[PDB]
Design a protein around this nucleic acid. Structure first.
Ligand SMILES: [Mg+2]
Ligand SMILES: [Mg+2]
Ligand SMILES: [Mg+2]
Ligand SMILES: [Mg+2]
Ligand SMILES: [Mg+2]
Ligand SMILES: [Mg+2]
Lengths: 74, 136, 93, 113, 166
RNA sequence: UCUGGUGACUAUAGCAAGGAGGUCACACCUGUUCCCAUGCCGAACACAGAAGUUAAGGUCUUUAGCGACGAUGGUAGCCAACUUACGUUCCGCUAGAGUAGAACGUUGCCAGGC
RNA sequence: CUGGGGCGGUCGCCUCCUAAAAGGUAACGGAGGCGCUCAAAGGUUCCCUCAGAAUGGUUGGAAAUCAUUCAUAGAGUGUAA
RNA sequence: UUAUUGGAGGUAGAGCACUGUUUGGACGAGGCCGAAUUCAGACAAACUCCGAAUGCCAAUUAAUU
C-alpha cells in the first residue's frame, strides 16, 4: 500500500434480501442510502446479490422434468 | 552394414594398434564365446559376413550377439593422385581389435553344435580366433 | 580342509614370473583377527577348492599356525594361458 | 506446502560475500555486529592470528532499558576499549549500514573512531 | 474482519480435533492469492486489459515479461499478463468475496485440486467480482486465481475450503 | 562441560532417514503511527512490541542405506640396459585407475555467560 | 608458395587439436571466426539466483504468463573456440 | 650431473560422472509395433570424476669435477 498510484476502496453494506451479510470492501461508489453501525458505517450503496438464497448445493431447487413413465394412461 | 548414425568429425586418426585389450574379454551374455588372439582390424563388412554365415548353420535358433560396433572412419584418397592436398573422403568404418577380446557370444545350443558354427565364421575374419566358455 | 602356503618373504623383484612358470600363485590375507601377510599357495590344489564347496565357502590354510577360516575374495584371471594369478583371501571372524 | 525461509542463513550466505574484501590486520582491527530479535552483539577480531580484542554485548545487564533502537542500541556503541584501538573497521552484514544498526555507529564515532 | 474471527473460533477446534494435531498453532493458514491473467495479443489489447483487474483488487498489477522469446509469436520482454499478490487484508477479503454466484452455472468449482498442496481455480469473464459493471467491457476478461496454504496435504486443502462451495 | 559469536580443517564434517526437549538465549508469530520500502504485496527489507507455541528452523543421540576419503598385495604403462625386425621378448627402479580390507555421523583457536 | 610448372586455392591477425603432462615445435594436416559493436552491454553501492522435470489451472502450439516441489550449474556471459 | 625436500602441467594408462557414439534385458508412450527413464556391458586426437614413469624451473641446500 505504497502511496499515490492506487484507486481507493473501502467497505460497504450489500443490502441482500437475506440478512445482508457483506460488509467487505470494493471499488464501487454511489449514494449511501441506508447506513448501519453493526457493519461498516460507510458508503452503503452496495445494492443486492444472490448470495445465500439458492446455492446449487446448499439449498433446494425445483424438481426434474420427466422420465419415460406414462402416468397419463397414454 | 552397421554404421554410426551421427559422427562428430568425419576425418579422424588411426588407433594405436599395440598393447593388450582394454576390457570386454570376459563373456557375459552367451554360454559360448569366440575371442581373438592377434592384432588386426575388422572393416564393418566382415562383421556382417560373419553374421550371415553364423545364422544359417543354427537356422536362426538360439541367441547370438555381436560385441564390436565400428566407430572410427578411415579414408582412402581417390584413384591414383599425387600426394598431398588434404585427406580423402571416408569409404568404410572400422573397430580395432586388440588380442584377447570377445567377438561373438552365442547361447541356446549344445556344445557340439555351436563349436562348429563359430569355426565356420572364423574363416570369414582377418584374425586368428580361439574357442572359450564362461570363465568361472 | 586342504590348503597350505608359506609366508612370502617381502620385497620380491620382477623375477616373480619365473616362479609363476611353476604352478604357484601369490596371495594376501586380510581379516578381523589377522595382519596382511603375503602368502604363496600352489594352485595344483586349486582344482580342490571347486571340489569342496565351489566358490563361496570356508577353507583353512595354516601358514605356520593360525589357519584362518577364509573365503576366496577375487581373481586376477588373465586369459591366453588359461590360468589364475593373484587370488585373495578374507577372514570371516 | 511452502516452508518459510529463515532470516538467519540468508544473512550468513551474504556474510562471506562481505568479509572477502576486508580482514582484521591486527593493527586496523575489525568490529562486526550481530542482531537476532532483541539483543545486538559486537566483537572485534584480528583475522591473522584469530584472537578477539574487546567483547561487548548489549544484553550484558549493564543497565536495564527499553526502546531497542534508542539508547539501548547506543549504550554498547559508547562501550569502548581503552586499548590501542584507533579508528576501526566495521562489518555491516545486516542491511542499511548507516541507518539500521546505526545506533552502533552513531556512538562508535563518538570516541572509537 | 468477521471472516478472520471465524478462522479464529470455528476452524480452531475443528481442524485440531478432526486431523488431530498436537499443538494449537498448527492449522493450515492461508498464504498469498496470486491472480494471473494472460492476453492472447502480443500487440495492443493488453493496453485495455490493465484497468479490468484493478477494479477487482486495486493493487496496480505488474506487467510481466517472457523468459525465452519462444517460437512463432513474440520476441523478448513483451507483456502477457498481470500478476497481483493479495496477502492479508485482501486475502481475508477477496476470498471473502464468495460471489462467484453471479456465474451461476454450477458454481461447484473443482474436485481434483493439484498434487502438491495448493489449490488453483478458474473463471470465465465478467461474472465474479461484483464491483465491476457489464457495460464498458466488450471482451472476455477471464482470470485465473489461486489459493496456497501452509498445509502439506491435499486432504487438508479439502477441509480448509469448507466455505467456498466445494 | 554445555549454549551462543567469530576463526582455521580437502564433505572423514553433508544430505538422506528416525526420536528428544526448553526458549533463562535463537525462532515462530502481534502489527505498521514512526526509520525505510516493495517496477505490487510490508511474505522479504526495516521499525514498534512479547499473551501464545515446540509442530517447523537450529540443538542433541542413534542408522553406514546416498555421496566422500581410503591401505597391503597385483596387472597395463614406463626412464636406463640387453637381444631382435617380431603389432617383440628378457632384466633392473619408480608405480597408478578401477576394485575389494575398511576408517567415518567431525576436528581444533579465541572471546561473553552457566 | 608449390611433392617439377601453368591451372584451382592460398598470403596478417584470434581460438582449439596434431604437440610426446613446463615453454616452444612443421606440412597443400583436421575444425572455426575477424577487418567491429555498446551512451549504455563502461565505474560504483546495494539486493536477487538459473535452463529444465513433474504436478494442475480462462485462453492451449508439444511449448506465449501464473503458482508449488525436486533442481551444483545440465542456463547465461553483445560477438567463433 | 647426483641425493634430499617443495612445485608447475593433464600425455601413456585407465574410466563412463561430463558433450557424443553404441548392442543387449525389464521399464510407457495408440486403439499389433514405436515414441522419456533403469540394470548388465563397450568407444574416443578436438570425452575426462581420476591419473604415473620420465623430463622442467628453484633451493643463499651437501658431495665430487
Ligand atoms: Mg524474515
Ligand atoms: Mg507480517
Ligand atoms: Mg604441382
Ligand atoms: Mg606443451
Ligand atoms: Mg588411451
Ligand atoms: Mg594419438
Amino acid at each position: 500500500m505504497k502511496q499515490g498510484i492506487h484507486p481507493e476502496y473501502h467497505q460497504v453494506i450489500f443490502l441482500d434480501t437475506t440478512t445482508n451479510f457483506k460488509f467487505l470492501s470494493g471499488s464501487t461508489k454511489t449514494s449511501s442510502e441506508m447506513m448501519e453501525w453493526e457493519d461498516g458505517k460507510e458508503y452503503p450503496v452496495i445494492r443486492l446479490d444472490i448470495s445465500s438464497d439458492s446455492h446449487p448445493f446448499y439449498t433446494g431447487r425445483q424438481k426434474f422434468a420427466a422420465a419415460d413413465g406414462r402416468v397419463e394412461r397414454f | 552394414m552397421l554404421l554410426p548414425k551421427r559422427v562428430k568429425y568425419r576425418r579422424q586418426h588411426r588407433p594405436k594398434t599395440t598393447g593388450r585389450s582394454k576390457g570386454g574379454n570376459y563373456v557375459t551374455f552367451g554360454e559360448f564365446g569366440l575371442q581373438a588372439t592377434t592384432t588386426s582390424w575388422i572393416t564393418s563388412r566382415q562383421i556382417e559376413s560373419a553374421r550371415i554365415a553364423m545364422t544359417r548353420y543354427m537356422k536362426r535358433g538360439g541367441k547370438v550377439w555381436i560385441k564390436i560396433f565400428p566407430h572410427t572412419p578411415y579414408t582412402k584418397k581417390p584413384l591414383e593422385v599425387r600426394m598431398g592436398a588434404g585427406k580423402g573422403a571416408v569409404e568404410g568404418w572400422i573397430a580395432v581389435v586388440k588380442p584377447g577380446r570377445i567377438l561373438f557370444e552365442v547361447a541356446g545350443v549344445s556344445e557340439e553344435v555351436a563349436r562348429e558354427a563359430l569355426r565356420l565364421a572364423s574363416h570369414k575374419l582377418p584374425v586368428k580366433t580361439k574357442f572359450v566358455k564362461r570363465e568361472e | 580342509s586342504l590348503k597350505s602356503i608359506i609366508r612370502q618373504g617381502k620385497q620380491t623383484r620382477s623375477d616373480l614370473k619365473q616362479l609363476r612358470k611353476s604352478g604357484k600363485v601369490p596371495a594376501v590375507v586380510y581379516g578381523y583377527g589377522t595382519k596382511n601377510v603375503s602368502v604363496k599357495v600352489d594352485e595344483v590344489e586349486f582344482i580342490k577348492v571347486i571340489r569342496e564347496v565351489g566358490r563361496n565357502g570356508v577353507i583353512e590354510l595354516g601358514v605356520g599356525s593360525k589357519t584362518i577360516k577364509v573365503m576366496v575374495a577375487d581373481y586376477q584371471f588373465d586369459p591366453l594361458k588359461n590360468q589364475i594369478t593373484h587370488i585373495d583371501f578374507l577372514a570371516i571372524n | 506446502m511452502i516452508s518459510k525461509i529463515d532470516k538467519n542463513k540468508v544473512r550468513l550466505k551474504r556474510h562471506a560475500r562481505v568479509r572477502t574484501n576486508l580482514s582484521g590486520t591486527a593493527e586496523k582491527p575489525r568490529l562486526n555486529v550481530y542482531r537476532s530479535n532483541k539483543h545486538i552483539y559486537a566483537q572485534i577480531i584480528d583475522d591473522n592470528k584469530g584472537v578477539t580484542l574487546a567483547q561487548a554485548s548489549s544484553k550484558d545487564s549493564d543497565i536495564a532499558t527499553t526502546a531497542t533502537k534508542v539508547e539501548l542500541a547506543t549504550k554498547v556503541g559508547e562501550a569502548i576499549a581503552k586499548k590501542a584501538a584507533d579508528k576501526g573497521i566495521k562489518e555491516i552484514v545486516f542491511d542499511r549500514g548507516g541507518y539500521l544498526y546505526h545506533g552502533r555507529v552513531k556512538a562508535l564515532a563518538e570516541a572509537a573512531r | 474482519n468477521r471472516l478472520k474471527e471465524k478462522f479464529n473460533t470455528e476452524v480452531t477446534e475443528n481442524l485440531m480435533k478432526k486431523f488431530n494435531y498436537s499443538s494449537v498453532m498448527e492449522v493450515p493458514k492461508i498464504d498469498k492469492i496470486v491472480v494471473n491473467m494472460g492476453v492472447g495479443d502480443a500487440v495492443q489489447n493488453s493496453k485495455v486489459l490493465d484497468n479490468a483487474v484493478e477494479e477487482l483488487e486495486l493493487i496496480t498489477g505488474q506487467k510481466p515479461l517472457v523468459t525465452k522469446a519462444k517460437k512463432s509469436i513474440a520476441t523478448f520482454r513483451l507483456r502477457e499478463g498481470m500478476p497481483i499478490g493479495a496477502k492479508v487484508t485482501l486475502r481475508g477479503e477477496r476470498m471473502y468475496e464468495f460471489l462467484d454466484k453471479l456465474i451461476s452455472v454450477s458454481l461447484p468449482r473443482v474436485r481434483d485440486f493439484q498434487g502438491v498442496s495448493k489449490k488453483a481455480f478458474d473463471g470465465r469473464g465478467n461474472y465474479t467480482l461484483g464491483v465491476k459493471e457489464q457495460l464498458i467491457f466488450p471482451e472476455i476478461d477471464y482470470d485465473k486465481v489461486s489459493k496456497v496454504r501452509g498445509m502439506d496435504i491435499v486432504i487438508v486443502t479439502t477441509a480448509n475450503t469448507d466455505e467456498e462451495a466445494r
